[PDB]
Design a protein around this ligand. Sequence first.
Ligand SMILES: *[C@@H]1O[C@H](CO)[C@@H](O[C@@H]2O[C@H](CO)[C@@H](O[C@@H]3O[C@H](CO[C@H]4O[C@H](CO[C@H]5O[C@H](CO)[C@@H](O)[C@H](O)[C@@H]5O)[C@@H](O)[C@H](O[C@H]5O[C@H](CO)[C@@H](O)[C@H](O)[C@@H]5O)[C@@H]4O)[C@@H](O)[C@H](O[C@H]4O[C@H](CO)[C@@H](O)[C@H](O)[C@@H]4O[C@H]4O[C@H](CO)[C@@H](O)[C@H](O)[C@@H]4O)[C@@H]3O)[C@H](O)[C@H]2NC(C)=O)[C@H](O)[C@H]1NC(C)=O
Ligand SMILES: *[C@@H]1O[C@H](CO)[C@@H](O[C@@H]2O[C@H](CO)[C@@H](O[C@@H]3O[C@H](CO[C@H]4O[C@H](CO)[C@@H](O)[C@H](O)[C@@H]4O)[C@@H](O)[C@H](O[C@H]4O[C@H](CO)[C@@H](O)[C@H](O)[C@@H]4O[C@H]4O[C@H](CO)[C@@H](O)[C@H](O)[C@@H]4O)[C@@H]3O)[C@H](O)[C@H]2NC(C)=O)[C@H](O)[C@H]1NC(C)=O
Ligand SMILES: *[C@@H]1O[C@H](CO)[C@@H](O[C@@H]2O[C@H](CO)[C@@H](O[C@@H]3O[C@H](CO[C@H]4O[C@H](CO)[C@@H](O)[C@H](O)[C@@H]4O)[C@@H](O)[C@H](O)[C@@H]3O)[C@H](O)[C@H]2NC(C)=O)[C@H](O)[C@H]1NC(C)=O
Ligand SMILES: *[C@@H]1O[C@H](CO)[C@@H](O[C@@H]2O[C@H](CO)[C@@H](O[C@@H]3O[C@H](CO)[C@@H](O)[C@H](O)[C@@H]3O)[C@H](O)[C@H]2NC(C)=O)[C@H](O)[C@H]1NC(C)=O
Ligand SMILES: *[C@@H]1O[C@H](CO)[C@@H](O[C@@H]2O[C@H](CO)[C@@H](O)[C@H](O)[C@H]2NC(C)=O)[C@H](O)[C@H]1NC(C)=O
Ligand SMILES: *[C@@H]1O[C@H](CO)[C@@H](O[C@@H]2O[C@H](CO)[C@@H](O)[C@H](O)[C@H]2NC(C)=O)[C@H](O)[C@H]1NC(C)=O
Ligand SMILES: *[C@@H]1O[C@H](CO)[C@@H](O[C@@H]2O[C@H](CO)[C@@H](O)[C@H](O)[C@H]2NC(C)=O)[C@H](O)[C@H]1NC(C)=O
Ligand SMILES: *[C@@H]1O[C@H](CO)[C@@H](O[C@@H]2O[C@H](CO)[C@@H](O)[C@H](O)[C@H]2NC(C)=O)[C@H](O)[C@H]1NC(C)=O
Ligand code: NAG
Ligand code: NAG
Ligand code: NAG
Ligand code: NAG
Ligand code: NAG
Ligand code: NAG
Ligand code: NAG
Ligand code: NAG
Ligand code: NAG
Ligand code: NAG
Ligand code: NAG
Ligand code: NAG
Ligand code: NAG
Ligand code: NAG
Ligand code: NAG
Ligand code: NAG
Ligand code: NAG
Ligand code: NAG
Lengths: 131, 131, 450, 40, 48, 48, 129, 96
Amino acid sequence: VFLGFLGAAGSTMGAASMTLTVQARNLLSGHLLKLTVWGIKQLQARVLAVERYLRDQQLLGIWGCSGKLICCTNVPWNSSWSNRNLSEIWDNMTWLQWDKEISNYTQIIYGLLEESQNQQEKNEQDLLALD
Amino acid sequence: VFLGFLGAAGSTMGAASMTLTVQARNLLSGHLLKLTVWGIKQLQARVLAVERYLRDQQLLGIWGCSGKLICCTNVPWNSSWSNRNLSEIWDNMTWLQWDKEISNYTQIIYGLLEESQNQQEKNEQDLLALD
Amino acid sequence: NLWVTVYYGVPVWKDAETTLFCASDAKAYETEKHNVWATHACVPTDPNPQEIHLENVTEEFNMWKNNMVEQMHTDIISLWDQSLKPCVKLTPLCVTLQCTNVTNNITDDMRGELKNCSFNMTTELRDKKQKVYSLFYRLDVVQINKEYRLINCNTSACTQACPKVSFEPIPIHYCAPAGFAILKCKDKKFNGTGPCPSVSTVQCTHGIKPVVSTQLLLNGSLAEEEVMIRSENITNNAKNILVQFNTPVQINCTRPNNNTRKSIRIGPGQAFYATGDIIGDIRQAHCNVSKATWNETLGKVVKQLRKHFGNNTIIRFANSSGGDLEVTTHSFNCGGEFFYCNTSGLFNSTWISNSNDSITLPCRIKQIINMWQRIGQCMYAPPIQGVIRCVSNITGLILTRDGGSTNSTTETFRPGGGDMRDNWRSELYKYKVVKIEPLGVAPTRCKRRV
Amino acid sequence: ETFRPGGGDMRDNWRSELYKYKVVKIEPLGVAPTRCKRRV
Amino acid sequence: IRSENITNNAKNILVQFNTPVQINCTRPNNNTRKSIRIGPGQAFYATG
Amino acid sequence: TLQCTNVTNNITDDMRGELKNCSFNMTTELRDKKQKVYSLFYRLDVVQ
Amino acid sequence: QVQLVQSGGQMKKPGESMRISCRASGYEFIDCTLNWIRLAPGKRPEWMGWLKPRWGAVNYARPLQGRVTMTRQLSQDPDDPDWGTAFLELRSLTVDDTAVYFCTRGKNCDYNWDFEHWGRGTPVIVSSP
Amino acid sequence: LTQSPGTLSLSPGETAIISCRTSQYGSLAWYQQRPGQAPRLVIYSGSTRAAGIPDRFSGSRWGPDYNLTISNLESGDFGVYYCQQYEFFGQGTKVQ
Ligand SMILES: *[C@@H]1O[C@H](CO)[C@@H](O[C@@H]2O[C@H](CO)[C@@H](O[C@@H]3O[C@H](CO[C@H]4O[C@H](CO[C@H]5O[C@H](CO)[C@@H](O)[C@H](O)[C@@H]5O)[C@@H](O)[C@H](O[C@H]5O[C@H](CO)[C@@H](O)[C@H](O)[C@@H]5O)[C@@H]4O)[C@@H](O)[C@H](O[C@H]4O[C@H](CO)[C@@H](O)[C@H](O)[C@@H]4O[C@H]4O[C@H](CO)[C@@H](O)[C@H](O)[C@@H]4O)[C@@H]3O)[C@H](O)[C@H]2NC(C)=O)[C@H](O)[C@H]1NC(C)=O
Ligand SMILES: *[C@@H]1O[C@H](CO)[C@@H](O[C@@H]2O[C@H](CO)[C@@H](O[C@@H]3O[C@H](CO[C@H]4O[C@H](CO)[C@@H](O)[C@H](O)[C@@H]4O)[C@@H](O)[C@H](O[C@H]4O[C@H](CO)[C@@H](O)[C@H](O)[C@@H]4O[C@H]4O[C@H](CO)[C@@H](O)[C@H](O)[C@@H]4O)[C@@H]3O)[C@H](O)[C@H]2NC(C)=O)[C@H](O)[C@H]1NC(C)=O
Ligand SMILES: *[C@@H]1O[C@H](CO)[C@@H](O[C@@H]2O[C@H](CO)[C@@H](O[C@@H]3O[C@H](CO[C@H]4O[C@H](CO)[C@@H](O)[C@H](O)[C@@H]4O)[C@@H](O)[C@H](O)[C@@H]3O)[C@H](O)[C@H]2NC(C)=O)[C@H](O)[C@H]1NC(C)=O
Ligand SMILES: *[C@@H]1O[C@H](CO)[C@@H](O[C@@H]2O[C@H](CO)[C@@H](O[C@@H]3O[C@H](CO)[C@@H](O)[C@H](O)[C@@H]3O)[C@H](O)[C@H]2NC(C)=O)[C@H](O)[C@H]1NC(C)=O
Ligand SMILES: *[C@@H]1O[C@H](CO)[C@@H](O[C@@H]2O[C@H](CO)[C@@H](O)[C@H](O)[C@H]2NC(C)=O)[C@H](O)[C@H]1NC(C)=O
Ligand SMILES: *[C@@H]1O[C@H](CO)[C@@H](O[C@@H]2O[C@H](CO)[C@@H](O)[C@H](O)[C@H]2NC(C)=O)[C@H](O)[C@H]1NC(C)=O
Ligand SMILES: *[C@@H]1O[C@H](CO)[C@@H](O[C@@H]2O[C@H](CO)[C@@H](O)[C@H](O)[C@H]2NC(C)=O)[C@H](O)[C@H]1NC(C)=O
Ligand SMILES: *[C@@H]1O[C@H](CO)[C@@H](O[C@@H]2O[C@H](CO)[C@@H](O)[C@H](O)[C@H]2NC(C)=O)[C@H](O)[C@H]1NC(C)=O
Ligand SMILES: *[C@@H]1O[C@H](CO)[C@@H](O)[C@H](O)[C@H]1NC(C)=O
Ligand SMILES: *[C@@H]1O[C@H](CO)[C@@H](O)[C@H](O)[C@H]1NC(C)=O
Ligand SMILES: *[C@@H]1O[C@H](CO)[C@@H](O)[C@H](O)[C@H]1NC(C)=O
Ligand SMILES: *[C@@H]1O[C@H](CO)[C@@H](O)[C@H](O)[C@H]1NC(C)=O
Ligand SMILES: *[C@@H]1O[C@H](CO)[C@@H](O)[C@H](O)[C@H]1NC(C)=O
Ligand SMILES: *[C@@H]1O[C@H](CO)[C@@H](O)[C@H](O)[C@H]1NC(C)=O
Ligand SMILES: *[C@@H]1O[C@H](CO)[C@@H](O)[C@H](O)[C@H]1NC(C)=O
Ligand SMILES: *[C@@H]1O[C@H](CO)[C@@H](O)[C@H](O)[C@H]1NC(C)=O
Ligand SMILES: *[C@@H]1O[C@H](CO)[C@@H](O)[C@H](O)[C@H]1NC(C)=O
Ligand SMILES: *[C@@H]1O[C@H](CO)[C@@H](O)[C@H](O)[C@H]1NC(C)=O
Ligand SMILES: *[C@@H]1O[C@H](CO)[C@@H](O)[C@H](O)[C@H]1NC(C)=O
Ligand SMILES: *[C@@H]1O[C@H](CO)[C@@H](O)[C@H](O)[C@H]1NC(C)=O
Ligand SMILES: *[C@@H]1O[C@H](CO)[C@@H](O)[C@H](O)[C@H]1NC(C)=O
Ligand SMILES: *[C@@H]1O[C@H](CO)[C@@H](O)[C@H](O)[C@H]1NC(C)=O
Ligand SMILES: *[C@@H]1O[C@H](CO)[C@@H](O)[C@H](O)[C@H]1NC(C)=O
Ligand SMILES: *[C@@H]1O[C@H](CO)[C@@H](O)[C@H](O)[C@H]1NC(C)=O
Ligand SMILES: *[C@@H]1O[C@H](CO)[C@@H](O)[C@H](O)[C@H]1NC(C)=O
Ligand SMILES: *[C@@H]1O[C@H](CO)[C@@H](O)[C@H](O)[C@H]1NC(C)=O
């Protein structure tokens, strides 16, 4: 059941959510001035590939999803973004059709996650403090 | 209540400890030889900004604070570093006055955290081992 | 009641552009022939491309607003420029030449095409001066006042190409960086733009040959099952028309002379190579193509060009209209010498809506090439000795239609290669580079414990 | 006091425009005493 | 008025105004730039 | 080796000999002929 | 800015040729195409043919096949590369060629047929007596 | 292309329509030549006005038909009007 890189791009969302490992593992990999022609094209690609990966790992770090892939959070799904069944979201569509559906409601969500974490860590630290 | 980058620098320590997200998110961001003049000034800045960030994330990794911001540990506050009330530390001072107060007792603390973690993981692995 | 839930690493991409890097195979690097497309400093490729075929996905492709052809055209220039810096400037060559006609063994068509120019020249010591002679073509000498001079000496100097390097195109590959992806359209009827419903991601594209030509794309990759016609808009006139064959017609481009490359010391440690004498008789360099498979191949294109214009128009061809020598004639570098071949024998037909004779194309050979039309560059190709002859495909063919007549019963297509990136856009049309956007939220039923 | 003009350096012009500025590096870690007792 | 030390002599004194005095720096001649070929493809421009 | 002389076309007495009319041999586009040109250099650019 | 400094008006005779100019300056000349349109006093405007100035690849209008010819002349000065001229020559003149000849240019040179910048006109009058 | 009315003799202030019946799918563009000058672009791509247009001009497309409705006629607008596809110009309508 090894599809490959991006191999479930047109598959179901309920089955593309089981192959997240391979797209997570392929986000970083690896007579004088002719070394500098290909070199500055290779060195500018390796540094950009790292700090793009560290951005999506830090942005995932401040939601309570430090070292996970399927991480689930506190904030509920606001139905104004979409009003669909769970069967009409998960086991019939694909992730490319889904990203066009809520492309307007990304930064609304990405601010909802950070505030639910800083509320959470200040309440966790006062729960074990009484300890 | 969005101050901005460093916006609570002179605020109270009890209220600058609620805006740690914005200073954590701004620690990494993003006719021939004139590209190399500005390029080696930009490429030496992006690589230094990454490995400075990875150093403070790895150093935070070996204390039991892998993906947290407000992480609290086992070792108690040695009163020789400071003997103050919790009200005279938290809800009256600022973080810049605090860093000058215990600038001599940083590396004493940063060795106290690493030994309390390696004691902890060797005792956790023998607690569930009997399992 | 449903709950937000992140998902790291979903297959979700976006159209983007970046700096794709080189790749090349094994033995094209270990032979160490110092190719001008320096793949010896480039990354060696994989043993096999992992051509993952996706399913159920229709990606919106476009070959005209692509960015890989803007990035290939910059890398070919910067490889053709960087490989000329360790070569010798011909700045002591701008002297007053004293030429005369060669009449050793001259046929009347190549009557005064090449002149025997004899000039003073500085030797290895900086105070003596030798008297040498050479053989320059008439496309490299202009008249001064018979005293001549080179065609460049009032507009730039000229690095001679170092004869260690070779302009033969080794196939280079383009690989996406980490975090990006290249999508190859595996459809066969994909014309120019739209949903290609059989996508297949690819880590590293196949062997792209960086060959340069005009009016006739050479050693290309052939479209199967048909002969296809690409255009950004078939009704526009400023837009070219890229034809791509299914069977390759064969071309035999030769040069009959047996010239002797002779070294000349100019200063210390810098040589200048010049045609000394022609061993034997002197004739014109020609190119052959068999008419039985050529007139058949023009019969395929007219049958496919009558889909866009109607099944009753009198499709006509004609030879090039105007321009200078690099667009009005077929131009290539066969084996290290530049042929400018006259294609007025090919494009001359008329189709009215219903074998070894071997059409010949007489060519002229130049040495002071420009190749990119950059004011201030020039590259005196050193003369290669012996007869030189190559045998090659003709897979692609560039056309531009013309004018307006208020009468759509006839269209007279003429060749023309006014850009140098239309060759490579006939090989990077299947590809598009996209960046992976791995984060993605979705509602499901999670309620966190703490 | 007899003041005379003189521009003996070329960086005194730009120091009349970069006087408001100073570059500092952020030191984001910081420990502090509070009342936490870890569970495990 | 800025200075690193107003009593030192080696240290300059940087004055910074609030209203800018205006300066009109002109040149009355109408010289003709004339190109000269020096070698191939290299020009040298001179007042003719 | 320049061969200069004073310009006195229309010269006021304060800019009396400030600019000189220097006429010198110079290599042309070909590396064996030599042209004879002239120019106008200020006195702060020529020594004797 | 984009300036198309054209030539001056001529007064030919039937049989002779002509040669009018057009000097493009202000933009990068060797990338964006040109055009050549004539405006008769009592007829349609008539397009005559473009000229991509890198290599001078021309394309004449089919009623003027084998009569009009269009050259260019780049700037070989490395100091000032973004200028250059463009010539036209219409052999075998007739009374019907009495017009005013413009050397237009596109708006942005990814689409040609939005003739924003025009020339001042080169009014050619061809009369038999 | 074909422009319908030919001549339009109006008093300054009225509205004026000019229709360019096209044939093939091309992006039309409108031109205005006052006598004694070079023409200039007013409308391109059918509807978009050119740079430096007082918005008294308007383009509207219904299939193989385009319009140019000038709202209020002024002094320096009584010239001639051409519509231009790929390389093909209209018959010309002289408004006056
Ligand atoms: C080179 O470049 C040029 C310039 O870019 C290219 O030209 C473009 O070519 C395309 C070819 O597809 C043309 O698209 C088609 O245009 C027609 C005409 O659209 C006009 O009419 C619309 C309705 O008018 C009706 O009545 C008239 C009679 O007067 C009929 O002639 C019409 O056909 C209609 O029945 C009107 O609504 C349009 O305005 C809107 O749409 C245009 C784009 O079309 C926009 O620019 C406007 O701003 C505005 O939004 C316009 O006035 C359309 O009718 C065609 O649309 C049909 O198909 C569409 C899907 O492809 C569908 O969404 C439409 O609703 C419509 O559907 C019809 O056909 C369906 C087939 O399934 C039927 O099911 C349906 O019931 C209906 O019958 C289409 O848009 C471009 O207009 C043209 N652009 C220009 C500037 O001319 C050229 O092709 C390029 N060449 C090449 C080869 O690359
Ligand atoms: C489109 O595609 C076609 C098909 O590939 C391609 O055709 C090729 O033509 C080129 C040009 O002729 C060929 O390259 C040369 O071939 C000649 C002949 O080679 C045959 O015989 C030799 C014998 O050794 C075999 O090894 C070879 O495999 C062939 O069977 C060779 O003589 C050439 O070698 C010289 O030039 C090289 C340039 O790279 C040098 O590296 C090399 O060392 C040789 O030059 C030197 O030695 C000479 C002899 O002493 C000396 O005189 C010179 O001064 C110099 O020192 C070269 O291999 C190529 O093989 C053809 N491919 C085929 C299969 O036909 C088209 O070129 C191509 N592109 C176009 C036209 O657009
Ligand atoms: C470097 O040297 C080159 C050769 O010495 C220089 O080229 C010449 O430049 C001049 C002007 O700078 C041109 O002169 C005029 O020519 C045009 C075009 O016409 C002539 O030739 C064509 C055939 O090619 C013919 O069809 C025409 O009818 C003309 O007879 C005329 O329109 C002008 O009126 C004027 O006569 C030369 O034509 C041109 N020669 C060539 C061979 O191109 C070049 O300018 C020099 N570069 C520098 C930077 O100095
Ligand atoms: C490209 O090739 C074509 C044909 O293959 C060339 O056209 C030919 O040019 C020659 C002269 O160069 C013309 O010849 C003359 O021939 C006539 C006989 O028709 C003779 O009476 C004259 O005295 C003169 O010698 C020949 O006619 C012409 N071919 C045709 C069909 O007209 C063309 O010139 C080549 N291109 C270039 C740039 O040379
Ligand atoms: C090579 O240089 C020599 C000397 O510079 C040239 O010889 C002379 O040519 C000039 C031409 O004006 C004559 O006036 C002299 O009388 C010649 N002198 C001798 C000793 O021959 C010679 O012509 C040059 N060679 C070439 C091919 O240009
Ligand atoms: C172009 O070159 C090829 C090979 O160099 C020629 O091909 C020979 O053609 C004959 C036809 O009589 C065949 O029998 C041979 O098998 C071919 N190969 C060899 C190695 O001899 C061809 O004739 C040339 N000319 C063209 C295509 O016009
Ligand atoms: C065009 O060039 C190609 C290679 O550059 C020639 O092809 C190989 O040719 C042999 C001979 O028939 C075929 O059996 C192979 O299948 C070809 N290779 C591939 C990968 O398909 C081809 O022969 C040339 N065309 C002509 C007409 O000679
Ligand atoms: C330019 O060069 C020529 C020749 O090199 C100079 O001419 C000669 O000058 C010398 C000076 O010592 C005289 O002895 C010769 O008799 C001159 N010969 C001729 C033919 O004039 C000339 O003076 C130089 N020009 C300048 C301005 O220096
Ligand atoms: C593609 O679509 C078909 C439709 O029948 C579906 O059965 C299949 O699961 C989808 N995915 C793959 C990977 O084939
Ligand atoms: C849901 O989203 C809308 C806008 O899309 C917003 O106005 C509303 O406040 C949101 N409600 C909740 C409960 O998130
Ligand atoms: C998203 O917003 C844009 C304007 O910002 C709008 O055009 C588009 O229709 C919106 N998408 C959805 C799905 O509402
Ligand atoms: C700054 O000091 C004032 C003192 O009155 C205090 O009230 C305030 O909270 C402090 N912080 C900010 C951000 O103003
Ligand atoms: C507290 O710190 C002092 C030095 O500041 C040290 O000597 C002492 O051992 C420390 N005690 C504890 C309990 O950490
Ligand atoms: C820290 O140590 C230095 C000497 O290492 C000393 O001068 C300074 O007073 C100390 N600071 C405190 C707060 O004790
Ligand atoms: C070329 O000229 C040289 C010198 O006159 C002479 O020795 C040689 O024979 C000539 N060769 C030809 C091809 O005319
Ligand atoms: C040399 O050849 C040219 C062109 O072939 C010709 O114009 C010239 O007259 C010839 N020289 C002599 C002396 O015949
Ligand atoms: C390609 O062909 C399809 C139909 O097979 C057509 O709809 C599309 O317009 C064509 N592409 C172009 C650029 O015309
Ligand atoms: C060319 O000349 C050389 C030297 O005379 C000879 O060895 C070679 O065989 C000749 N080539 C041909 C094709 O005649
Ligand atoms: C090409 O055409 C010429 C024209 O006569 C002929 O002599 C020759 O045999 C043909 N073939 C080759 C390979 O040159
Ligand atoms: C070209 O082929 C067509 C049929 O494919 C034939 O009718 C015609 O006579 C051929 N022309 C020549 C010159 O062989
Ligand atoms: C034109 O005729 C051909 C005959 O083979 C036919 O295939 C094609 O569909 C026709 N096209 C039109 C538009 O009638
Ligand atoms: C071009 O075609 C015409 C008609 O088919 C013919 O008379 C003429 O000889 C041809 N010219 C060439 C060079 O093939
Ligand atoms: C300078 O001279 C030129 C050429 O004679 C003339 O066009 C220009 O107006 C003059 N400038 C002044 C300020 O007189
Ligand atoms: C400068 O000298 C040259 C050569 O003598 C002369 O032609 C020109 O008139 C002189 N100009 C001036 C300003 O003296
Ligand atoms: C030329 O001018 C200089 C300085 O103005 C002067 O010293 C010199 O005597 C002048 N030359 C002559 C011949 O008067
Ligand atoms: C153009 O104006 C006429 C005037 O009656 C109108 O009938 C027609 O519908 C208009 N067309 C468009 C496309 O606006």
